[PDB]
Symmetry: C2
Subunit: 390 residues, 2 copies
């Protein structure tokens, strides 16, 4: 072939299309029974396929400017234009998040059809054994035979959800060719609480609060879910990429309001209501009960509360420090932080600086998006950028 791509996911199929459209004869190999398994299950089966605000600040990397070039060369609109062209209903939800109306599968079907038109060859349920450099490019050995190619594209994703065929193949190939690998971790993952915290929040399983999840300078406002394993909801998932074991996150419940103010207002205006009943006018019932207990104010009358006491109560709700036991790991993470070091890669090409004809695209790379369509957009953009050069 002129081009062999490992992994028929978001980045791989995009690259395929662009290289097939250039008349380049391309072959895509994947160990799965079906292409784009993550696409398929993503955005709750709807696929949050991009985000209108996609830009360098929405990604974590060791070199923050690395993604600048690809992102500008392939924008959310460009992908939207592609979807509309295939009659795929889409809409925005919150925070710039674009979803399909019908199902993630429309997108798979689409990429598929685009590949068929571009002349690319797809081989599924095919495992990779080795890759060797050759005087002429590369040879890859597979459970189905061997292929030679001038260009080889590593588009095999990251470590999240092993059950779906996630592997670290990309990292093994990077190291094999001497490319550094930025240390990887489960990201956009729920966070665990220890048996004691879980006992204390015993009765709050199922509550869902509007909240800021803060770690130092990073803050996200979205739902926080309390479960029997601990903390999830989009705000946890976001901050989970910034947090590290041993550390505290700070939760601001009902972040747009000032609870101390409210409570003093209710104090004059009514006065003779129980504390937990005043809180229940502000928070879901179970949370109200919880915060009134912890503070030892249950059944106490709102008018008997000093200012100092109210401030402390508010503070317990709006500056709530939690120290997570850990993360739930790769069986539950949406994304892998870290990956093939960017410094070793051509920003406008995706090609290994040290190894002509070798390319790394998509999530396997040390560019990691916030939750909200940013990861798919990076997959798109970098697949596209490689597809122009490959």
């Amino acid at each position: 072939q002129d081009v062999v791509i490992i992994g028929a996911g978001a980045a791989g199929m995009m690259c395929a299309i662009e290289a097939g459209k250039r008349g380049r004869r391309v072959l895509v190999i994947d160990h799965a029974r079906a292409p784009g398994e993550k696409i398929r299950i993503s955005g709750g089966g709807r696929c949050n396929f991009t985000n209108i605000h996609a830009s360098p600040r929405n990604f974590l990397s060791g070199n923050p400017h690395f993604c600048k070039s690809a992102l500008a060369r392939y924008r959310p609109q460009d992908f939207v234009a592609l979807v509309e062209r295939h009659g795929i209903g889409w809409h925005e939800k919150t925070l710039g998040q674009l979803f399909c109306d019908h199902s993630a599968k429309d997108i798979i079907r689409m990429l598929m059809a685009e590949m068929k038109e571009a002349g690319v060859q797809l081989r599924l349920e095919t495992s990779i054994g080795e890759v060797e450099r050759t005087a002429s490019g590369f040879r890859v050995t597979t459970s189905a035979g061997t292929v030679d190619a001038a260009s080889l594209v590593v588009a095999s994703g990251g470590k999240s959800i092993p059950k779906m065929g996630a592997t670290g193949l990309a990292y093994r190939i990077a190291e094999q060719f001497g490319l550094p690998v930025v240390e990887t971790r489960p990201a956009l993952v729920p966070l665990t609480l220890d048996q004691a915290q879980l006992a204390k929040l015993g009765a709050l399983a199922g509550v869902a609060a509007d909240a800021e999840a803060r770690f130092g300078k990073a803050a996200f406002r979205e739902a926080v879910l309390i479960t029997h394993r601990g903390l999830s909801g989009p705000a946890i998932l976001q901050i989970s990429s910034y947090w590290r074991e041993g550390e505290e996150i700070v939760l601001r419940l009902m972040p747009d309001i000032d609870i101390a103010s409210i409570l003093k207002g209710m104090r004059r205006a009514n006065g003779r209501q129980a504390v937990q009943t005043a809180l229940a006018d502000i928070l879901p019932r179970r949370l109200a009960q919880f915060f009134a207990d912890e503070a030892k104010l249950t059944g106490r009358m709102l008018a008997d509360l000093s200012d100092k006491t109210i401030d402390a109560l508010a503070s317990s709700i709006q500056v709530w420090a939690v120290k997570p036991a850990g993360s739930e790991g790769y069986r539950t993470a949406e994304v892998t932080l870290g990956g093939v070091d960017t410094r070793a890669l051509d920003s406008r090409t995706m090609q290994a600086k040290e190894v002509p004809g070798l390319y790394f695209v998509g999530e396997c790379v040390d560019v990691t998006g916030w939750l909200g369509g940013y990861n798919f957009q990076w997959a798109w953009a970098s697949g596209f950028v490689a597809g122009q050069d490959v």
Copy 2:
């Protein structure tokens, strides 16, 4: 005198200080028994004395660029520097809002002391009868006698809270000298609901929700209060300056979350809970009961709810259109929108373009700040700018 100022409020005393410090002999006249009565009662008696983000976008005007010059010449830091210099404890709350730690009166005492040092003369409980142009400047007639001055500064505020000595004096003087007056209205004011709306929200008096209050392109996220008169809380107050009679505002309750998502999640995860009980895991109890009733789902089991039904329920909570009966008017507004037309005023001076030696500062002018310290900062800046020229 060299300079007579009408109104010993925020803008007037600031101007006084700056003109007194220049050796200009100044006199401040006020019909009140005490200076800075609004300062005194402002920020809940604490005084929200500025906002660190103060800038042109935080103000409504007929000429949006008018305030640019003054704001840059006198910044929140400049005022902070002044407070610290007088040993006045201050802190930030939310949204850039600076407050005193002790009381608004510290600030009054301070401005006072600064005036005494600057040599300015203060006359209180003194009413204004007329102002005439003179070959030499101005003559003002007062319940205490007459004064002549080369410069006359109108710093008499707006129409809000008549009980505290608010009057439209500024507007009467503008018109008398042919300066146009941008149409005035109660702003940062609660909004009223009609008897029918008030009956429907009968049982929600006292609830306080995190919410977005939206009118077209304007949106503010803060607390929304439901009372027996209707709607208040900072988010109402903010949007009230943008809204107009006959129109709708849209309320997004729990704006950082997607309730449709949450509810579908709770549907799989639990399933056999009553709708209103699922909502109570998200909203204060009374709101949960309200939204479940309106939608006619009370006691219904969360797993018997179609997607379409959930979407509609969510939408009722997060795209909630309300048509207000009116505003509560000037007895309750924090600020007056509109005022002396800016186009008629020197942006870098506050002087009437058509009338040498006549100046208009502070709230009487057609520059109106969002809630959060922006109005005091405009008072400061414009008082200061005038005080340099006067």
